[PDB]
Amino acid sequence: HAFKPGDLVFAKMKGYPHWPARIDDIADGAVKPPPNKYPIFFFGTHETAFLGPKDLFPYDKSKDKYGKPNKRKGFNEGLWEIQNNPH
């Protein structure tokens, strides 16, 4: 798999900017998560969704293009978390 639990990323959902996030472990409450897809935790807002690799940008490579402040609520908080408290 391209990603594993604990890897940091910018995750992209329709209607939102490329958002600081991480790959979580699969919840024990969930039913099997599809082959192509990952459980994402978004820093700042602390939402989850399932997303595929086309929407996941490794954090290191990508921080120059995406890791900059944003007006959307929770984003700058999220930036802080990904650097300083990624758990």
PDB file of N, CA and C in Angstrom:
ATOM      1  N   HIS A   1       0.854  -1.228   0.000  1.00  0.00           N
ATOM      2  CA  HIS A   1       0.000   0.000   0.000  1.00  0.00           C
ATOM      3  C   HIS A   1       0.871   1.252   0.000  1.00  0.00           C
ATOM      4  N   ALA A   2       0.418   2.267  -0.731  1.00  0.00           N
ATOM      5  CA  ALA A   2       1.128   3.521  -0.803  1.00  0.00           C
ATOM      6  C   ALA A   2       1.264   4.158   0.585  1.00  0.00           C
ATOM      7  N   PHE A   3       0.214   4.099   1.413  1.00  0.00           N
ATOM      8  CA  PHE A   3       0.223   4.734   2.723  1.00  0.00           C
ATOM      9  C   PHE A   3       0.034   3.706   3.837  1.00  0.00           C
ATOM     10  N   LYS A   4       0.461   4.087   5.050  1.00  0.00           N
ATOM     11  CA  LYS A   4       0.259   3.278   6.238  1.00  0.00           C
ATOM     12  C   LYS A   4      -0.158   4.170   7.397  1.00  0.00           C
ATOM     13  N   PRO A   5      -0.847   3.601   8.416  1.00  0.00           N
ATOM     14  CA  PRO A   5      -1.219   4.335   9.631  1.00  0.00           C
ATOM     15  C   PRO A   5      -0.096   5.190  10.197  1.00  0.00           C
ATOM     16  N   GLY A   6      -0.350   6.474  10.422  1.00  0.00           N
ATOM     17  CA  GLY A   6       0.645   7.340  11.039  1.00  0.00           C
ATOM     18  C   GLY A   6       1.299   8.299  10.044  1.00  0.00           C
ATOM     19  N   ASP A   7       1.187   8.025   8.734  1.00  0.00           N
ATOM     20  CA  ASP A   7       1.778   8.875   7.713  1.00  0.00           C
ATOM     21  C   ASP A   7       1.001  10.181   7.647  1.00  0.00           C
ATOM     22  N   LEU A   8       1.724  11.296   7.428  1.00  0.00           N
ATOM     23  CA  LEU A   8       1.108  12.621   7.438  1.00  0.00           C
ATOM     24  C   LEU A   8       0.874  13.035   6.004  1.00  0.00           C
ATOM     25  N   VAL A   9      -0.153  13.872   5.755  1.00  0.00           N
ATOM     26  CA  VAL A   9      -0.583  14.122   4.399  1.00  0.00           C
ATOM     27  C   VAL A   9      -1.402  15.412   4.361  1.00  0.00           C
ATOM     28  N   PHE A  10      -1.632  15.865   3.130  1.00  0.00           N
ATOM     29  CA  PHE A  10      -2.715  16.789   2.814  1.00  0.00           C
ATOM     30  C   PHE A  10      -3.764  15.962   2.091  1.00  0.00           C
ATOM     31  N   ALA A  11      -5.004  16.003   2.589  1.00  0.00           N
ATOM     32  CA  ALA A  11      -6.088  15.217   2.054  1.00  0.00           C
ATOM     33  C   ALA A  11      -7.043  16.183   1.379  1.00  0.00           C
ATOM     34  N   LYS A  12      -7.584  15.797   0.229  1.00  0.00           N
ATOM     35  CA  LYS A  12      -8.381  16.731  -0.556  1.00  0.00           C
ATOM     36  C   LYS A  12      -9.794  16.192  -0.710  1.00  0.00           C
ATOM     37  N   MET A  13     -10.764  17.002  -0.265  1.00  0.00           N
ATOM     38  CA  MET A  13     -12.163  16.729  -0.497  1.00  0.00           C
ATOM     39  C   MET A  13     -12.762  17.906  -1.243  1.00  0.00           C
ATOM     40  N   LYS A  14     -13.675  17.555  -2.160  1.00  0.00           N
ATOM     41  CA  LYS A  14     -14.449  18.486  -2.961  1.00  0.00           C
ATOM     42  C   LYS A  14     -15.019  19.566  -2.044  1.00  0.00           C
ATOM     43  N   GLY A  15     -14.663  20.817  -2.319  1.00  0.00           N
ATOM     44  CA  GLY A  15     -15.258  21.949  -1.624  1.00  0.00           C
ATOM     45  C   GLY A  15     -14.363  22.424  -0.485  1.00  0.00           C
ATOM     46  N   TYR A  16     -13.226  21.747  -0.270  1.00  0.00           N
ATOM     47  CA  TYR A  16     -12.317  22.130   0.788  1.00  0.00           C
ATOM     48  C   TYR A  16     -10.898  22.212   0.243  1.00  0.00           C
ATOM     49  N   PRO A  17     -10.028  23.061   0.831  1.00  0.00           N
ATOM     50  CA  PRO A  17      -8.624  23.118   0.424  1.00  0.00           C
ATOM     51  C   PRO A  17      -7.865  21.873   0.879  1.00  0.00           C
ATOM     52  N   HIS A  18      -6.771  21.576   0.203  1.00  0.00           N
ATOM     53  CA  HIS A  18      -5.913  20.463   0.580  1.00  0.00           C
ATOM     54  C   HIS A  18      -5.555  20.593   2.047  1.00  0.00           C
ATOM     55  N   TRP A  19      -5.974  19.620   2.847  1.00  0.00           N
ATOM     56  CA  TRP A  19      -6.113  19.830   4.274  1.00  0.00           C
ATOM     57  C   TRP A  19      -5.111  18.963   5.029  1.00  0.00           C
ATOM     58  N   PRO A  20      -4.407  19.491   6.065  1.00  0.00           N
ATOM     59  CA  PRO A  20      -3.467  18.676   6.832  1.00  0.00           C
ATOM     60  C   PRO A  20      -4.226  17.519   7.456  1.00  0.00           C
ATOM     61  N   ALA A  21      -3.612  16.323   7.413  1.00  0.00           N
ATOM     62  CA  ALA A  21      -4.299  15.150   7.880  1.00  0.00           C
ATOM     63  C   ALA A  21      -3.306  14.013   8.133  1.00  0.00           C
ATOM     64  N   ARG A  22      -3.828  12.911   8.656  1.00  0.00           N
ATOM     65  CA  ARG A  22      -3.041  11.696   8.798  1.00  0.00           C
ATOM     66  C   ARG A  22      -3.893  10.481   8.445  1.00  0.00           C
ATOM     67  N   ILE A  23      -3.183   9.376   8.133  1.00  0.00           N
ATOM     68  CA  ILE A  23      -3.746   8.045   7.964  1.00  0.00           C
ATOM     69  C   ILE A  23      -3.890   7.452   9.365  1.00  0.00           C
ATOM     70  N   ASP A  24      -5.122   7.095   9.752  1.00  0.00           N
ATOM     71  CA  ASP A  24      -5.427   6.445  11.020  1.00  0.00           C
ATOM     72  C   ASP A  24      -5.311   4.927  10.897  1.00  0.00           C
ATOM     73  N   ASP A  25      -5.274   4.213  12.018  1.00  0.00           N
ATOM     74  CA  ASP A  25      -5.580   2.796  12.002  1.00  0.00           C
ATOM     75  C   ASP A  25      -7.068   2.631  11.688  1.00  0.00           C
ATOM     76  N   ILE A  26      -7.430   1.472  11.120  1.00  0.00           N
ATOM     77  CA  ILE A  26      -8.827   1.156  10.858  1.00  0.00           C
ATOM     78  C   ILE A  26      -9.524   1.057  12.213  1.00  0.00           C
ATOM     79  N   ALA A  27     -10.653   1.752  12.365  1.00  0.00           N
ATOM     80  CA  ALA A  27     -11.465   1.609  13.565  1.00  0.00           C
ATOM     81  C   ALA A  27     -11.982   0.171  13.641  1.00  0.00           C
ATOM     82  N   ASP A  28     -12.052  -0.355  14.879  1.00  0.00           N
ATOM     83  CA  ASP A  28     -12.563  -1.692  15.164  1.00  0.00           C
ATOM     84  C   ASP A  28     -14.092  -1.732  15.055  1.00  0.00           C
ATOM     85  N   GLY A  29     -14.745  -0.562  15.114  1.00  0.00           N
ATOM     86  CA  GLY A  29     -16.176  -0.433  14.858  1.00  0.00           C
ATOM     87  C   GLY A  29     -16.543  -0.513  13.372  1.00  0.00           C
ATOM     88  N   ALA A  30     -15.602  -0.171  12.479  1.00  0.00           N
ATOM     89  CA  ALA A  30     -15.897  -0.099  11.053  1.00  0.00           C
ATOM     90  C   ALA A  30     -15.965  -1.500  10.434  1.00  0.00           C
ATOM     91  N   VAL A  31     -16.686  -1.589   9.320  1.00  0.00           N
ATOM     92  CA  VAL A  31     -16.694  -2.784   8.500  1.00  0.00           C
ATOM     93  C   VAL A  31     -15.540  -2.599   7.519  1.00  0.00           C
ATOM     94  N   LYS A  32     -15.060  -3.697   6.925  1.00  0.00           N
ATOM     95  CA  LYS A  32     -13.817  -3.672   6.164  1.00  0.00           C
ATOM     96  C   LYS A  32     -13.778  -2.428   5.271  1.00  0.00           C
ATOM     97  N   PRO A  33     -12.673  -1.645   5.311  1.00  0.00           N
ATOM     98  CA  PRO A  33     -12.510  -0.470   4.441  1.00  0.00           C
ATOM     99  C   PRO A  33     -12.007  -0.867   3.052  1.00  0.00           C
ATOM    100  N   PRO A  34     -12.517  -0.275   1.957  1.00  0.00           N
ATOM    101  CA  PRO A  34     -12.235  -0.812   0.631  1.00  0.00           C
ATOM    102  C   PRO A  34     -10.740  -1.012   0.400  1.00  0.00           C
ATOM    103  N   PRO A  35     -10.350  -1.796  -0.621  1.00  0.00           N
ATOM    104  CA  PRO A  35      -8.935  -1.972  -0.961  1.00  0.00           C
ATOM    105  C   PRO A  35      -8.204  -0.669  -1.298  1.00  0.00           C
ATOM    106  N   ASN A  36      -8.821   0.192  -2.110  1.00  0.00           N
ATOM    107  CA  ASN A  36      -8.100   1.357  -2.607  1.00  0.00           C
ATOM    108  C   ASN A  36      -7.958   2.472  -1.553  1.00  0.00           C
ATOM    109  N   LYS A  37      -8.549   2.343  -0.355  1.00  0.00           N
ATOM    110  CA  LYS A  37      -8.890   3.529   0.412  1.00  0.00           C
ATOM    111  C   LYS A  37      -8.333   3.483   1.829  1.00  0.00           C
ATOM    112  N   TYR A  38      -8.280   4.674   2.441  1.00  0.00           N
ATOM    113  CA  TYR A  38      -7.653   4.894   3.738  1.00  0.00           C
ATOM    114  C   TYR A  38      -8.593   5.681   4.635  1.00  0.00           C
ATOM    115  N   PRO A  39      -8.611   5.394   5.958  1.00  0.00           N
ATOM    116  CA  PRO A  39      -9.238   6.287   6.938  1.00  0.00           C
ATOM    117  C   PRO A  39      -8.375   7.519   7.207  1.00  0.00           C
ATOM    118  N   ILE A  40      -8.935   8.701   6.979  1.00  0.00           N
ATOM    119  CA  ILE A  40      -8.213   9.937   7.175  1.00  0.00           C
ATOM    120  C   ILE A  40      -8.763  10.612   8.430  1.00  0.00           C
ATOM    121  N   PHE A  41      -7.855  11.157   9.251  1.00  0.00           N
ATOM    122  CA  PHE A  41      -8.156  12.130  10.278  1.00  0.00           C
ATOM    123  C   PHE A  41      -7.605  13.497   9.869  1.00  0.00           C
ATOM    124  N   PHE A  42      -8.501  14.485   9.751  1.00  0.00           N
ATOM    125  CA  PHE A  42      -8.155  15.866   9.491  1.00  0.00           C
ATOM    126  C   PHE A  42      -7.863  16.612  10.792  1.00  0.00           C
ATOM    127  N   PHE A  43      -6.633  17.115  10.928  1.00  0.00           N
ATOM    128  CA  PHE A  43      -6.220  17.984  12.007  1.00  0.00           C
ATOM    129  C   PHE A  43      -7.027  19.276  11.994  1.00  0.00           C
ATOM    130  N   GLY A  44      -7.128  19.914  13.172  1.00  0.00           N
ATOM    131  CA  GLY A  44      -7.867  21.175  13.317  1.00  0.00           C
ATOM    132  C   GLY A  44      -9.365  20.966  13.584  1.00  0.00           C
ATOM    133  N   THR A  45     -10.087  20.416  12.594  1.00  0.00           N
ATOM    134  CA  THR A  45     -11.506  20.104  12.697  1.00  0.00           C
ATOM    135  C   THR A  45     -11.681  18.713  13.289  1.00  0.00           C
ATOM    136  N   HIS A  46     -10.738  17.798  13.044  1.00  0.00           N
ATOM    137  CA  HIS A  46     -10.806  16.487  13.678  1.00  0.00           C
ATOM    138  C   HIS A  46     -11.908  15.593  13.082  1.00  0.00           C
ATOM    139  N   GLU A  47     -12.345  15.888  11.854  1.00  0.00           N
ATOM    140  CA  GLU A  47     -13.260  15.060  11.092  1.00  0.00           C
ATOM    141  C   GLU A  47     -12.545  13.821  10.545  1.00  0.00           C
ATOM    142  N   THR A  48     -13.322  12.804  10.147  1.00  0.00           N
ATOM    143  CA  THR A  48     -12.764  11.717   9.360  1.00  0.00           C
ATOM    144  C   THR A  48     -13.512  11.567   8.043  1.00  0.00           C
ATOM    145  N   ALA A  49     -12.829  10.923   7.092  1.00  0.00           N
ATOM    146  CA  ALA A  49     -13.444  10.347   5.915  1.00  0.00           C
ATOM    147  C   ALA A  49     -12.498   9.274   5.403  1.00  0.00           C
ATOM    148  N   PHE A  50     -13.016   8.472   4.477  1.00  0.00           N
ATOM    149  CA  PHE A  50     -12.267   7.501   3.700  1.00  0.00           C
ATOM    150  C   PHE A  50     -11.892   8.162   2.381  1.00  0.00           C
ATOM    151  N   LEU A  51     -10.621   8.064   2.015  1.00  0.00           N
ATOM    152  CA  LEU A  51     -10.135   8.687   0.789  1.00  0.00           C
ATOM    153  C   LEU A  51      -9.118   7.764   0.130  1.00  0.00           C
ATOM    154  N   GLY A  52      -9.005   7.914  -1.187  1.00  0.00           N
ATOM    155  CA  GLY A  52      -8.044   7.173  -1.980  1.00  0.00           C
ATOM    156  C   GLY A  52      -6.800   7.994  -2.312  1.00  0.00           C
ATOM    157  N   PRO A  53      -5.740   7.321  -2.820  1.00  0.00           N
ATOM    158  CA  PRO A  53      -4.448   7.948  -3.093  1.00  0.00           C
ATOM    159  C   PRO A  53      -4.466   9.181  -3.989  1.00  0.00           C
ATOM    160  N   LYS A  54      -5.430   9.291  -4.906  1.00  0.00           N
ATOM    161  CA  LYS A  54      -5.491  10.449  -5.785  1.00  0.00           C
ATOM    162  C   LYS A  54      -5.802  11.726  -5.005  1.00  0.00           C
ATOM    163  N   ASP A  55      -6.259  11.570  -3.755  1.00  0.00           N
ATOM    164  CA  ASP A  55      -6.660  12.687  -2.916  1.00  0.00           C
ATOM    165  C   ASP A  55      -5.697  12.843  -1.732  1.00  0.00           C
ATOM    166  N   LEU A  56      -4.629  12.029  -1.684  1.00  0.00           N
ATOM    167  CA  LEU A  56      -3.646  12.067  -0.624  1.00  0.00           C
ATOM    168  C   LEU A  56      -2.267  12.501  -1.138  1.00  0.00           C
ATOM    169  N   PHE A  57      -1.707  13.557  -0.529  1.00  0.00           N
ATOM    170  CA  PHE A  57      -0.433  14.139  -0.918  1.00  0.00           C
ATOM    171  C   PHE A  57       0.556  14.032   0.226  1.00  0.00           C
ATOM    172  N   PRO A  58       1.657  13.269   0.086  1.00  0.00           N
ATOM    173  CA  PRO A  58       2.558  13.095   1.223  1.00  0.00           C
ATOM    174  C   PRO A  58       3.014  14.474   1.695  1.00  0.00           C
ATOM    175  N   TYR A  59       3.106  14.620   3.016  1.00  0.00           N
ATOM    176  CA  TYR A  59       3.084  15.899   3.700  1.00  0.00           C
ATOM    177  C   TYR A  59       4.361  16.672   3.391  1.00  0.00           C
ATOM    178  N   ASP A  60       5.474  15.937   3.474  1.00  0.00           N
ATOM    179  CA  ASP A  60       6.829  16.434   3.295  1.00  0.00           C
ATOM    180  C   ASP A  60       6.996  17.053   1.908  1.00  0.00           C
ATOM    181  N   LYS A  61       6.839  16.216   0.877  1.00  0.00           N
ATOM    182  CA  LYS A  61       6.888  16.652  -0.507  1.00  0.00           C
ATOM    183  C   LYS A  61       6.006  17.882  -0.710  1.00  0.00           C
ATOM    184  N   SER A  62       4.863  17.966   0.000  1.00  0.00           N
ATOM    185  CA  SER A  62       3.732  18.781  -0.443  1.00  0.00           C
ATOM    186  C   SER A  62       3.539  20.048   0.388  1.00  0.00           C
ATOM    187  N   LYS A  63       4.301  20.194   1.472  1.00  0.00           N
ATOM    188  CA  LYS A  63       3.975  21.217   2.449  1.00  0.00           C
ATOM    189  C   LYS A  63       4.262  22.597   1.886  1.00  0.00           C
ATOM    190  N   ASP A  64       5.182  22.673   0.932  1.00  0.00           N
ATOM    191  CA  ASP A  64       5.524  23.941   0.316  1.00  0.00           C
ATOM    192  C   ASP A  64       4.336  24.480  -0.479  1.00  0.00           C
ATOM    193  N   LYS A  65       3.550  23.592  -1.096  1.00  0.00           N
ATOM    194  CA  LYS A  65       2.424  24.024  -1.916  1.00  0.00           C
ATOM    195  C   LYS A  65       1.145  24.133  -1.075  1.00  0.00           C
ATOM    196  N   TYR A  66       0.954  23.267  -0.063  1.00  0.00           N
ATOM    197  CA  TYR A  66      -0.315  23.252   0.677  1.00  0.00           C
ATOM    198  C   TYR A  66      -0.214  23.750   2.120  1.00  0.00           C
ATOM    199  N   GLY A  67       0.964  23.606   2.743  1.00  0.00           N
ATOM    200  CA  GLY A  67       1.177  23.960   4.136  1.00  0.00           C
ATOM    201  C   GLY A  67       1.411  25.460   4.285  1.00  0.00           C
ATOM    202  N   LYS A  68       0.323  26.224   4.152  1.00  0.00           N
ATOM    203  CA  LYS A  68       0.297  27.665   4.320  1.00  0.00           C
ATOM    204  C   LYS A  68      -1.073  28.042   4.905  1.00  0.00           C
ATOM    205  N   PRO A  69      -1.188  29.129   5.696  1.00  0.00           N
ATOM    206  CA  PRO A  69      -2.448  29.477   6.342  1.00  0.00           C
ATOM    207  C   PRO A  69      -3.596  29.600   5.350  1.00  0.00           C
ATOM    208  N   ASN A  70      -4.813  29.349   5.876  1.00  0.00           N
ATOM    209  CA  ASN A  70      -6.085  29.367   5.154  1.00  0.00           C
ATOM    210  C   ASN A  70      -7.160  29.992   6.063  1.00  0.00           C
ATOM    211  N   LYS A  71      -8.145  30.686   5.478  1.00  0.00           N
ATOM    212  CA  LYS A  71      -9.236  31.314   6.218  1.00  0.00           C
ATOM    213  C   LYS A  71     -10.287  30.324   6.749  1.00  0.00           C
ATOM    214  N   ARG A  72     -10.347  29.094   6.210  1.00  0.00           N
ATOM    215  CA  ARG A  72     -11.364  28.134   6.627  1.00  0.00           C
ATOM    216  C   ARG A  72     -11.168  27.787   8.106  1.00  0.00           C
ATOM    217  N   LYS A  73     -12.269  27.664   8.859  1.00  0.00           N
ATOM    218  CA  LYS A  73     -12.199  27.497  10.290  1.00  0.00           C
ATOM    219  C   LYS A  73     -11.484  26.184  10.584  1.00  0.00           C
ATOM    220  N   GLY A  74     -10.500  26.243  11.466  1.00  0.00           N
ATOM    221  CA  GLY A  74      -9.825  25.063  11.973  1.00  0.00           C
ATOM    222  C   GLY A  74      -8.515  24.769  11.245  1.00  0.00           C
ATOM    223  N   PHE A  75      -8.294  25.404  10.085  1.00  0.00           N
ATOM    224  CA  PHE A  75      -7.179  25.036   9.217  1.00  0.00           C
ATOM    225  C   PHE A  75      -5.809  25.342   9.848  1.00  0.00           C
ATOM    226  N   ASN A  76      -5.651  26.585  10.309  1.00  0.00           N
ATOM    227  CA  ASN A  76      -4.412  27.037  10.942  1.00  0.00           C
ATOM    228  C   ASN A  76      -4.168  26.264  12.234  1.00  0.00           C
ATOM    229  N   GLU A  77      -5.255  25.984  12.981  1.00  0.00           N
ATOM    230  CA  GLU A  77      -5.133  25.080  14.112  1.00  0.00           C
ATOM    231  C   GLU A  77      -4.558  23.750  13.622  1.00  0.00           C
ATOM    232  N   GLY A  78      -5.094  23.251  12.495  1.00  0.00           N
ATOM    233  CA  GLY A  78      -4.689  21.979  11.910  1.00  0.00           C
ATOM    234  C   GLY A  78      -3.225  21.956  11.494  1.00  0.00           C
ATOM    235  N   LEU A  79      -2.782  23.030  10.844  1.00  0.00           N
ATOM    236  CA  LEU A  79      -1.366  23.175  10.522  1.00  0.00           C
ATOM    237  C   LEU A  79      -0.502  23.008  11.770  1.00  0.00           C
ATOM    238  N   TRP A  80      -0.940  23.613  12.875  1.00  0.00           N
ATOM    239  CA  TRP A  80      -0.164  23.560  14.097  1.00  0.00           C
ATOM    240  C   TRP A  80      -0.048  22.120  14.587  1.00  0.00           C
ATOM    241  N   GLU A  81      -1.176  21.403  14.530  1.00  0.00           N
ATOM    242  CA  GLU A  81      -1.253  20.038  15.023  1.00  0.00           C
ATOM    243  C   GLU A  81      -0.319  19.133  14.223  1.00  0.00           C
ATOM    244  N   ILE A  82      -0.343  19.295  12.901  1.00  0.00           N
ATOM    245  CA  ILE A  82       0.423  18.382  12.083  1.00  0.00           C
ATOM    246  C   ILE A  82       1.919  18.540  12.379  1.00  0.00           C
ATOM    247  N   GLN A  83       2.378  19.738  12.750  1.00  0.00           N
ATOM    248  CA  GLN A  83       3.787  19.929  13.062  1.00  0.00           C
ATOM    249  C   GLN A  83       4.137  19.527  14.489  1.00  0.00           C
ATOM    250  N   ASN A  84       3.219  19.744  15.439  1.00  0.00           N
ATOM    251  CA  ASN A  84       3.573  19.832  16.847  1.00  0.00           C
ATOM    252  C   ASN A  84       2.861  18.775  17.688  1.00  0.00           C
ATOM    253  N   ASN A  85       1.739  18.232  17.187  1.00  0.00           N
ATOM    254  CA  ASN A  85       0.953  17.250  17.913  1.00  0.00           C
ATOM    255  C   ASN A  85       0.268  16.298  16.933  1.00  0.00           C
ATOM    256  N   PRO A  86       1.019  15.605  16.042  1.00  0.00           N
ATOM    257  CA  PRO A  86       0.408  14.778  15.007  1.00  0.00           C
ATOM    258  C   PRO A  86      -0.353  13.568  15.539  1.00  0.00           C
ATOM    259  N   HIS A  87      -0.254  13.285  16.857  1.00  0.00           N
ATOM    260  CA  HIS A  87      -1.208  12.424  17.559  1.00  0.00           C
ATOM    261  C   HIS A  87      -2.161  13.252  18.421  1.00  0.00           C
TER     262      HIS A  87
END
